[PDB]
């Protein structure tokens, strides 16, 4: 069926440029116009640009007009978006989308969305995380159940993966979504509920992995 | 710039329920309104165009209605596959999206379990102190967490994070992180997080003393 593959996203310092691409298949790409639409937690869904099937007409949102340039290569069936003068608020997931087929005098929008590519505009430098244990004790015990975890603080960029006991412990694991700090570094927590009668005897180790820096850390969490 | 507004922002519902959501435009958009469904960590999917035309492949239990400035989306009988976020979109003059309506899995009330964690000695050695307050397995999502340091309310130095509905039991978990400098942290004694939730008859307070 229809398939769209985005590429080109990543971390970019403010003021630099970046070129996104969108590979289309499953339909005649040259017969349809395309959209670029971005989505961020702060602004929700936000349309960016539209281009005609032959590239003859292009339109842009006011917040991006004069900075973004959308183009296409119908011989390669490839859609391009050159983004210049990027600002911090441009961090979002960007989708390319195909306009649906309709009548000649109707209005038009999109029916098929791409997979999406993440763009993070930040001046933060790549940095591995600090893994700290959230040690269980009497102060983290309610009845026969205790809670322990690992705090994965001050890493850049996203993402990081957290496992427990090399993946052997998954029941009761809660990995919270990451939060962005004032310093541009991410931080998250991973928690697990365990039987209180097992503290001090069962060994719990959290395995934090950060592919951008090839970081692998096995931190043992001991009770207090 | 056409403003869009969706209501409600969040709707707790159950499989088989009749769901009606509304969408309003800042100006008349005639019938040029589309409805899109997006599941978390997944690409958005087209449901309805021309405010009332069902997209091919969309089950008949979905229907659209409305024209001008008022539009409604109706699900006759909710099914588990329909738990997603639904956006309306005007396409009469450019394209603007609403804030989105999240369909939540309605369940019985469950009070949160509250746990507190002090900063680790390594982070304290690093010059910072993060205190973590945990709310486990609670419903509904609405809750309030207030940090109190020596009976003084904190403001502007905490961050909250909420998980999505658990796939197994549709519950939430919440983390609150209070961040302070080592000097600010060592300039006080008692550190507490107070939690209020509709499943709790009285607020729950967890606290520790620095060094204890």
């Amino acid at each position: 069926q229809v398939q769209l593959v985005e590429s080109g996203g990543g971390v970019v310092q403010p003021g630099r440029s970046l070129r996104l691409s969108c590979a289309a298949s499953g339909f005649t790409f040259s017969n349809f116009g395309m959209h670029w639409i971005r989505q961020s937690p702060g602004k929700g869904l936000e349309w960016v640009a539209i281009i005609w099937y032959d590239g003859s007409n292009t339109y842009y949102a006011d917040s991006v007009k004069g900075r973004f340039t959308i183009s296409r290569d119908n011989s390669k069936n490839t859609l391009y978006l050159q983004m210049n003068s990027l600002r911090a608020e441009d961090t979002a997931v960007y989708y390319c989308a195909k306009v649906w087929f309709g009548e000649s005098e109707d209005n038009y929008s999109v029916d098929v969305w791409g997979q999406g590519t993440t763009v993070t505009v930040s001046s933060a430098s790549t940095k591995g995380p600090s893994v700290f244990p959230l040690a269980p004790s009497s102060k983290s015990t309610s009845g026969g159940t205790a809670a322990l975890g690992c705090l994965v603080k001050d890493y850049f960029p996203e993402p990081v993966t957290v496992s427990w006991n090399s993946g052997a412990l998954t029941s009761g694991v809660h990995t919270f979504p990451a939060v962005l700090q004032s310093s541009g570094l991410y931080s998250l927590s991973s928690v697990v509920t365990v039987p209180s009668s097992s503290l001090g005897t069962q060994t719990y180790i959290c395995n934090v992995n950060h592919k951008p820096s090839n970081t692998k850390v096995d931190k043992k969490v001991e009770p207090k | 710039d056409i403003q869009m507004t969706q209501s409600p922002s969040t709707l707790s519902t159950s499989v088989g329920d009749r769901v009606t959501i509304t969408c309003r435009a800042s100006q008349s958009i005639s019938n040029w309104l589309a409805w899109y469904q997006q599941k978390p960590g997944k690409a958005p999917k087209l449901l309805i165009y021309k405010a009332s035309t069902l997209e091919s492949g969309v089950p008949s239990r979905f229907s659209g209605s409305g024209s001008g400035t008022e539009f409604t989306l109706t699900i006759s009988s909710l099914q588990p596959d329909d738990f997603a976020t639904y956006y309306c979109q005007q396409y009469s003059s450019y394209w603007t999206f609403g804030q989105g309506t999240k369909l939540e899995i309605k369940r019985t009330v469950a009070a949160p379990s509250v746990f507190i964690f002090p900063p680790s000695d390594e982070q304290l050695k690093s010059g910072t102190a993060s205190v973590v307050c945990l709310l486990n397995n609670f419903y509904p999502r609405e809750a309030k967490v207030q940090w109190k340091v020596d009976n003084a309310l904190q403001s502007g130095n905490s961050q909250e994070s909420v998980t999505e509905q658990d796939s197994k039991d549709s519950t939430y978990s919440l983390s609150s992180t209070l961040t302070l400098s080592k000097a600010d942290y060592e300039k006080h004694k008692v550190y507490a997080c107070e939690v209020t939730h509709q499943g709790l008859s009285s607020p729950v307070t967890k606290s520790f003393n620095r060094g204890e």
Binding site: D54, N57, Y108 | -
Partner: peptide
């Protein structure tokens, strides 16, 4: 928002 298709 006219017809952007052939």
């Amino acid at each position: 928002n006219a017809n952007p298709n052939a």
